[PDB]
Every structure is written in structure tokens, then in C-alpha cells.
Amino acid sequence: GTLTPHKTISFGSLTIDPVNRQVLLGGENVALSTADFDLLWELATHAGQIMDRDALLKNLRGVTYDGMDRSVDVAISRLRKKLLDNATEPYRIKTVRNKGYLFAPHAWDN
Numbered sequence: 001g002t003l004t005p006h007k008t009i010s011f012g013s014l015t016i017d018p019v020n021r022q023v024l025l026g027g028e029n030v031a032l033s034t035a036d037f038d039l040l041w042e043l044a045t046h047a048g049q050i051m052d053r054d055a056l057l058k059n060l061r062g063v064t065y066d067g068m069d070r071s072v073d074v075a076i077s078r079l080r081k082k083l084l085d086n087a088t089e090p091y092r093i094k095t096v097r098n099k100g101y102l103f104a105p106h107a108w109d110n
Contacts, residue, residue, distance in 0.1 A: 009044050012107050013092045014083065016044050026088045032078065035060045039075045043093075043101070048108060052100040076101060 004010060008017035014025040023030045023040060032040070042059040043051055053072040060071060080093060092104040 011044060011047070011092065011103070011109070013085065013089050014040065014044070016041060025083060026085065030082060032082060033075075035071055036075045036078050036082075039072075039079060047103055050096060050100045050102050056100070 005017060005019075008015070008019060010016070014023055014030070016023050023032065023037070038060045039056060042056065053069040054066060056075075057068050057072050060075070061068065080091060083093060084091060090104065092107045093101060094104050096102050
């Protein structure tokens with residue numbers, strides 16, 4: 001009794017679909033800067049696995065320029081600040097012990 005896709009990826013909070021190249025959280029689309037958009041794109045695809053800043057930015061740019069966390073930080077803060085859900089849902093996107101950013105312990109997919 002739920003209208004949800006299968007090919008695309010959708011979590012218990014946000015949803016990402018390459019067909020519409022957009023993200024939907026809480027039933028409504030979420031606007032995010034190019035980078036911020038790419039950040040989550042990989043963040044979800046690599047759920048469960050700890051995504052490091054250096055390994056994250058690599059997806060945003062893809063250049064040989066390492067140590068470019070500068071963009072990552074800004075992106076993260078922009079991701080949570082925009083996905084700071086409280087009434088509808090918590091902040092699934094929690095931060096790990098200075099090891100990056102992973103999903104909440106109550107969010108996962110086999």
C-alpha cells in the first residue's frame with residue numbers, strides 16, 4: 001500500500017531518483033546547490049559505509065586536488081541546516097566520531 005519506486009534509491013527520510021534528477025524529503029522536493037546535490041547522491045548510494053570528506057568531495061569535483069574539504073564542510077552544514085527535520089523526522093544524517101558523516105543508527109537498507 002505504498003507508491004514507491006524500486007530502481008531508484010529512497011531512505012526513510014530523503015529520496016533520490018536519477019529519473020527526475022531530484023531529491024524528495026518529507027514528501028516535498030529539496031533544493032540544494034550543485035555540490036550539495038552531488039554530495040547526497042553519493043552519500044545515499046554508499047549508505048551504511050562511512051563517507052569521509054576527502055572521499056566525498058572526490059564525487060563532487062573528481063579532480064586530483066586533494067585536501068579540498070573546504071567545500072565539504074560548507075555542503076554538510078547546508079545539508080543538515082536544510083534537512084534539520086524535527087517534527088516530521090529527526091536528523092538521520094548524523095555525524096560520526098570525527099570520521100565523516102553517516103546515517104542514523106535507526107536508518108538502514110538491506
